Design a protein around this motif. Sequence first.
Motif, PDB file in Angstrom:
ATOM      1  N   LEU A   1       0.796  -1.331   0.358  1.00 45.09           N
ATOM      2  CA  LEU A   1       0.093   0.047  -0.039  1.00 45.09           C
ATOM      3  C   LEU A   1       0.798   1.357   0.052  1.00 45.09           C
ATOM      4  CD1 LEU A   1      -2.522  -0.833   3.032  1.00 45.09           C
ATOM      5  CD2 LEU A   1      -2.917  -1.402   0.382  1.00 45.09           C
ATOM      6  N   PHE A   2       0.373   2.391  -0.921  1.00 45.87           N
ATOM      7  CA  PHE A   2       0.702   3.516  -0.071  1.00 45.87           C
ATOM      8  C   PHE A   2       0.272   4.184   1.062  1.00 45.87           C
ATOM      9  CE2 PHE A   2       2.430   4.091  -4.809  1.00 45.87           C
ATOM     10  CZ  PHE A   2       0.950   3.205  -5.449  1.00 45.87           C
ATOM     11  N   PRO A   3       1.369   4.696   2.277  1.00 46.84           N
ATOM     12  CA  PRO A   3       0.751   4.720   3.211  1.00 46.84           C
ATOM     13  C   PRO A   3       0.595   5.824   3.278  1.00 46.84           C
ATOM     14  CG  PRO A   3       3.159   4.833   2.708  1.00 46.84           C
ATOM     15  CD  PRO A   3       3.118   4.606   1.444  1.00 46.84           C
ATOM     16  N   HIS A   4       1.249   7.050   2.097  1.00 44.77           N
ATOM     17  CA  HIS A   4       0.498   7.997   2.589  1.00 44.77           C
ATOM     18  C   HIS A   4      -1.356   8.696   1.510  1.00 44.77           C
ATOM     19  CE1 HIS A   4       1.280   8.883  -1.796  1.00 44.77           C
ATOM     20  NE2 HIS A   4       1.865   7.896  -1.806  1.00 44.77           N
TER      21      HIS A   4
ATOM     22  N   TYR B   1      -6.572   5.424   6.836  1.00 43.04           N
ATOM     23  CA  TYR B   1      -4.632   5.443   6.252  1.00 43.04           C
ATOM     24  C   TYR B   1      -4.297   3.703   6.219  1.00 43.04           C
ATOM     25  CZ  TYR B   1      -4.262  10.696   4.232  1.00 43.04           C
ATOM     26  OH  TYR B   1      -4.666  11.964   4.619  1.00 43.04           O
ATOM     27  N   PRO B   2      -3.436   4.157   5.613  1.00 42.60           N
ATOM     28  CA  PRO B   2      -3.314   2.498   5.343  1.00 42.60           C
ATOM     29  C   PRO B   2      -2.353   1.539   7.174  1.00 42.60           C
ATOM     30  CG  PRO B   2      -2.400   3.453   3.664  1.00 42.60           C
ATOM     31  CD  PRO B   2      -2.981   4.544   4.171  1.00 42.60           C
ATOM     32  N   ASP B   3      -2.044   2.756   8.365  1.00 37.39           N
ATOM     33  CA  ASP B   3      -1.375   3.482   9.257  1.00 37.39           C
ATOM     34  C   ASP B   3      -2.457   2.536   9.733  1.00 37.39           C
ATOM     35  OD1 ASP B   3      -2.546   5.393  10.272  1.00 37.39           O
ATOM     36  OD2 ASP B   3      -0.772   6.187  10.428  1.00 37.39           O
TER      37      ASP B   3
ATOM     38  N   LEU C   1      -4.856   0.238   9.396  1.00 35.38           N
ATOM     39  CA  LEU C   1      -4.960  -0.649   9.516  1.00 35.38           C
ATOM     40  C   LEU C   1      -4.220  -1.818  10.331  1.00 35.38           C
ATOM     41  CD1 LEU C   1      -5.270  -0.395   5.701  1.00 35.38           C
ATOM     42  CD2 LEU C   1      -7.322  -0.322   6.970  1.00 35.38           C
ATOM     43  N   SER C   2      -4.618  -3.351  10.519  1.00 38.53           N
ATOM     44  CA  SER C   2      -4.031  -4.584  11.226  1.00 38.53           C
ATOM     45  C   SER C   2      -3.247  -5.276   9.524  1.00 38.53           C
ATOM     46  CB  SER C   2      -4.453  -5.559  11.520  1.00 38.53           C
ATOM     47  OG  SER C   2      -5.566  -6.038  10.608  1.00 38.53           O
TER      48      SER C   2
ATOM     49  N   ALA D   1      -4.589  -4.749   5.778  1.00 38.92           N
ATOM     50  CA  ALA D   1      -4.097  -4.350   5.027  1.00 38.92           C
ATOM     51  C   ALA D   1      -3.378  -4.743   4.211  1.00 38.92           C
ATOM     52  CB  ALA D   1      -2.603  -3.964   5.984  1.00 38.92           C
TER      53      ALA D   1
ATOM     54  N   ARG E   1       1.107  14.596   8.715  1.00 38.76           N
ATOM     55  CA  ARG E   1       0.580  14.672   7.214  1.00 38.76           C
ATOM     56  C   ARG E   1       0.106  15.992   6.820  1.00 38.76           C
ATOM     57  NH1 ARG E   1      -3.491  10.421   9.408  1.00 38.76           N
ATOM     58  NH2 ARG E   1      -2.703   8.736   9.302  1.00 38.76           N
TER      59      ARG E   1
ATOM     60  N   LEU F   1      -0.470  16.086   2.675  1.00 37.16           N
ATOM     61  CA  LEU F   1      -1.301  15.100   2.743  1.00 37.16           C
ATOM     62  C   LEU F   1      -2.645  15.034   3.351  1.00 37.16           C
ATOM     63  CD1 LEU F   1       1.857  12.373   3.785  1.00 37.16           C
ATOM     64  CD2 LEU F   1       1.293  13.337   1.462  1.00 37.16           C
TER      65      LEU F   1
ATOM     66  N   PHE G   1       7.426   6.545   7.067  1.00 29.09           N
ATOM     67  CA  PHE G   1       6.159   5.742   7.723  1.00 29.09           C
ATOM     68  C   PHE G   1       6.192   5.057   8.535  1.00 29.09           C
ATOM     69  CE2 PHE G   1       5.120   8.569   3.937  1.00 29.09           C
ATOM     70  CZ  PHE G   1       3.655   8.929   4.876  1.00 29.09           C
ATOM     71  N   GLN G   2       4.939   4.556   9.597  1.00 30.44           N
ATOM     72  CA  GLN G   2       5.659   2.966  10.273  1.00 30.44           C
ATOM     73  C   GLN G   2       5.792   1.263   9.286  1.00 30.44           C
ATOM     74  OE1 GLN G   2       2.039   2.034  12.808  1.00 30.44           O
ATOM     75  NE2 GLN G   2       2.769   0.536  13.651  1.00 30.44           N
ATOM     76  N   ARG G   3       5.055   1.498   8.369  1.00 30.99           N
ATOM     77  CA  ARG G   3       4.925   0.700   7.567  1.00 30.99           C
ATOM     78  C   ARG G   3       4.879   1.427   5.732  1.00 30.99           C
ATOM     79  NH1 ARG G   3       1.582   0.204  10.140  1.00 30.99           N
ATOM     80  NH2 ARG G   3      -0.663  -1.098   9.232  1.00 30.99           N
ATOM     81  N   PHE G   4       4.713   0.554   5.081  1.00 35.29           N
ATOM     82  CA  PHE G   4       4.296   0.615   3.495  1.00 35.29           C
ATOM     83  C   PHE G   4       5.527   1.605   2.648  1.00 35.29           C
ATOM     84  CE2 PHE G   4       0.840  -1.558   4.283  1.00 35.29           C
ATOM     85  CZ  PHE G   4       0.141  -1.441   5.884  1.00 35.29           C
TER      86      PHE G   4
END
Lengths: 242, 242
Positions: free
Chosen positions: A90-93, A135-137, A139-140, A144, B47, B52, B85-88
């Motif tokens: 995923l795009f985290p932004h 936002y992706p953050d 999500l578990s 994700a 963000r 963003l 970011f944390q992930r992705f």
Amino acid sequence: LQMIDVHQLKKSFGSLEVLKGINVHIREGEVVVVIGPSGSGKSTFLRCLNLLEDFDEGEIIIDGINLKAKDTNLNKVREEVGMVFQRFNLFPHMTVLNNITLAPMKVRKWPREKAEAKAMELLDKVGLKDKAHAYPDSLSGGQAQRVAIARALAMEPKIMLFDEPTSALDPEMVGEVLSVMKQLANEGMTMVVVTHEMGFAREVGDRVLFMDGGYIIEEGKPEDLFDRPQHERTKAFLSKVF
Amino acid sequence: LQMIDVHQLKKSFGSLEVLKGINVHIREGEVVVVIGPSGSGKSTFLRCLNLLEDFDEGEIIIDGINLKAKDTNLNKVREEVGMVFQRFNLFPHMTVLNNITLAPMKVRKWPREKAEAKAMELLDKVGLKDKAHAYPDSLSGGQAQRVAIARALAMEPKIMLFDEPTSALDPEMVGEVLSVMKQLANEGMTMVVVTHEMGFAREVGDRVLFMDGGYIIEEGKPEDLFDRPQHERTKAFLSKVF
Ligand SMILES: Nc1ncnc2c1ncn2[C@@H]1O[C@H](COP(=O)(O)OP(=O)(O)OP(O)(O)=S)[C@@H](O)[C@H]1O
Ligand SMILES: Nc1ncnc2c1ncn2[C@@H]1O[C@H](COP(=O)(O)OP(=O)(O)OP(O)(O)=S)[C@@H](O)[C@H]1O
Ligand SMILES: [Mg+2]
């Protein structure tokens, strides 16, 4: 034997020939499962299929068209094959929705309302319409990975590639993604799934290919392969895996 | 009030007021650590800094330029602010070298060898040049997240934002990521770091901002905020985490 056709596929990274001559022929609507230890060329194999890596020799035909023919549009193929990875999907932004709608708009030139309508439909299907604007953050890992699937499905591909989609996830998050993939098989999707989850393989896969050291060493029905393996290397691998 | 300048920043998602009046003024070369419970608006805040998300009320000024002024080139600000970011953080479908060079080539129109020489030296500095031609899923969490910093630095930002860069990492992978961040702090980078890594905050941190329920509830030097918190919410939050 029609959707994916692979003849004498070989690949080298300088010294290490990682695919040493592999042959596979996947029919429309066939779920094929790829298993085997680390360093077998499982991911390299999927990459060649997804036009992310070129190969040194052999033939790859997808939907009856050749990947190395001068006349063939590689970008046209690129959008007929979907791929979900182990991580970084995923795009985290971007919001969950904008993740899904990006390509169908950028590539297939869809209008926003149309693309978002189908994206909400896919989020519904995976059980995450209530996360469209998240936002992706937020999500578990299981959530994700289900959004990654939805992302790929929005291009409405003919083939879906899965490279260990549940391997980086906690065990409580695995079956979440496997049930979406399971459902996807039930709807006649040509799938190539690289996995170590053997219960998925037996439950869902039409054939299992055991890859080791750059070869497909043994293959066949899941029941046949898991219950009565014939090759020492297959037996050795299955004696230590799930 | 040089590098980052925020006045009565407010953001809502529907009837949900997420930021409720953020005032913070970050100097050039200042390293600010942000801590606080879930749902505090820490990510929303970052963000807004990274352009963003839009905001409902208030003012944001990145290096003397107002994000809502008429003559403002938003994209030119976007390129001077980096974010991890944390992930992705990575593209799974392309190599480590390609991940890093993608943006400087598209955005700055650098030729391939120019971008790659810059990426190679960046990989060297994070101790990962040997992984240049590797794919993200071959990397550990520690490695992946270091490449994520390399990607961000390739655009040559003057502001580096970090949203819980080590949170989703196994504890042994946390160390070497914070080493890169420390080196970045020691080199004069303006950094906003959302992190509950105390040792990091104490060592290279200039200030710690305690966020809770949309407010910065308390701030101050790390030693001061960690060891002698004045506000009871800060004390209560510290007690349950550290
Ligand atoms: N981009 C690359 N450059 C150089 N060598 C590579 C690259 N990608 C893969 N390899 C080599 O191929 C082997 C990795 O196998 P893969 O092609 O990643 O398939 P795999 O079986 O999925 O591997 P794992 O680790 O089991 S998931 C390693 O021994 C690498 O040295
Ligand atoms: N796009 C969105 N739509 C609706 N609600 C949102 C959205 N983004 C954030 N929120 C909500 O805003 C609140 C604060 O958001 P964040 O900035 O993610 O807080 P946080 O301090 O980063 O929390 P965590 O989980 O510790 S990183 C949460 O209650 C979220 O549910
Ligand atoms: Mg692999």
